[PDB]
Design a protein around this ligand. Structure first.
Ligand SMILES: Cc1ncc(COP(=O)(O)O)c(C/N=C(\CCC(=O)O)C(=O)O)c1O
Ligand SMILES: Cc1ncc(COP(=O)(O)O)c(CN)c1O
Lengths: 275, 276
């Protein structure tokens, strides 16, 4: 069964509740991470917890626990789940923004759920993305505000995921780092504009190992007709091929050879970053 | 009276009200709300606020969890229990799931009742400062719970009262307020194609129509501020709050102006007409 660690206890997820006074509810003041397991070990646990502290600090939220305490809770919850686990620690604003311009009464909780990988057919056929003219503000911060990822899909035509394409510059997915492949090169937005993805970081290391050139610039929507391949990355989805962006088919409209090769190398290599 | 929360069919003490962590308002910021205030313990613009709430929900793919008649019933019953000037905030949550049908079909709702806290009389006397930012509210007709930018954007606000959304130097609105500029004795305010349909905004345009004061529904430009006489922001609690500084730019003579004070007086004299 799914779990939530809150107020010092592991509860059944469905029993865990938060006071309506919390500014995560009232004003969307919250940050979080998604951590996933392979062989019941958390992948890039330390990078994820460093990113969470980064998100909190950048949002003027005082950490309500040490990273060592959060790692302790995360390991104990994975052990209790006894399966491959998706873990989501949340840090809330809590009830007040002080005279000192900090959230000093932050609450936190940690969700544990059995991992749900995208369906194997989505790796075989790839997915469609819906481009929007919008950006994530303070893009290095992973806040809980994913409203546009849902609302901005009243007319997404069954797309898997939103693509933030401010003024036609591709930055990233609502849940994913975006990679374009052009002439055998990787193109991905720089971390000035895109979240510093853990999967992103591993793919750049794999590209270095493979002597695959990476350009850290925003691919343009206007470059898509000349791309060979595209994929999106995240700890759960791994490398997921993108065969359509809006009305634009990417290359031949099926997952490409460099995407499949990089996904195979990822799966073979991720032991190195298991904690 | 103590603060209340209506949730799961009961009025609780606010401090006892809790929401499941499974709710996507918590996990993903899927939430919309309104702020309703009282004059003489009667709700101001209750129907326009509830229609705006349904607008917000519908535009966010959230299936309303109660009828507007039921929400109105709850709001009136809570005001009666408070027996004082009340700020009322109904919230509509995403609930636990986004369906294969691209809707939030298990929305929750709750309603907070709190004693009204007006800005300090000194802020009406001296006016306030706004901090301009190069950003916009996406889905601007929708009032969502996402106010993170209003808080984080105060590392460098220089003590501003409120952030002002000034995408590409075009003034749209505050994080919590409608923005009005005064030039040559008339009103400039962003159109509702770009700004929230403020209930205070709507009343101010009707008062302008009655007073034969010209309203231009265009985004005032940061570059026009040196030529403005006055500015103010509006919201159901703050009423008309003078703005004497935007960024490093002083507005007019740097004190509240005569058309702002006149419109605030007519507002307060006339307010009964929009009570329900
Ligand atoms: C805005 C955004 N960009 C990029 C990423 C990719 O980051 P990483 O490679 O560190 O996972 C995420 C992860 N979004 C997730 C997890 C999705 C996944 O694991 O595939 C989320 O919680 O939505 C994200 O939310
Ligand atoms: C973005 C925004 N703009 C304007 C307003 C003012 O609307 P009203 O006059 O209905 O309070 C609010 C309400 N706090 C708001 O959140």
């Amino acid at each position: 069964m799914n779990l939530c660690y809150i107020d010092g206890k592991f509860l059944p997820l469905e029993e865990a509740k938060l006071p309506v006074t919390d500014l995560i509810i009232q004003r969307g003041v919250g940050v979080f991470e998604t951590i996933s397991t392979h062989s019941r070990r958390p992948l890039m646990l330390t990078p994820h917890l460093k990113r969470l502290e980064g998100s909190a600090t950048a949002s003027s939220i005082v950490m309500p626990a040490t990273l060592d305490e959060m790692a302790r809770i995360i390991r104990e919850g994975i052990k209790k789940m006894g399966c491959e686990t998706m873990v989501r620690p949340y840090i809330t604003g809590g009830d007040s923004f002080g005279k000192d311009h900090l959230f000093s009464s932050s609450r936190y909780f940690v969700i544990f759920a059995e991992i749900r990988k995208p369906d194997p057919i989505l790796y075989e056929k790839g997915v469609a993305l819906h481009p929007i003219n919008a950006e994530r503000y303070l893009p290095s911060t992973k806040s809980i505000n994913y409203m546009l990822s849902f609302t901005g899909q009243r007319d997404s035509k069954g797309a898997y995921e939103i693509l933030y394409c401010p003024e036609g510059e591709i930055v990233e997915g609502s849940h994913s780092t975006f990679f374009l492949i052009k002439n055998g090169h990787l193109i991905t937005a720089p971390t000035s504009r895109a979240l510093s993805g853990t999967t992103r970081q591993i793919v750049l290391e794999l590209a270095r190992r493979g002597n695959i050139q990476v350009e850290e610039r925003c691919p343009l929507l206007t470059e898509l007709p000349e791309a060979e391949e595209a994929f999106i990355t995240g700890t759960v989805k791994e490398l997921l091929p993108v065969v359509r962006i809006g009305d634009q088919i990417i290359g031949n409209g099926v997952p490409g050879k460099l995407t499949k090769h990089l996904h195979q190398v990822y799966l073979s290599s991720i032991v190195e970053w298991l904690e």
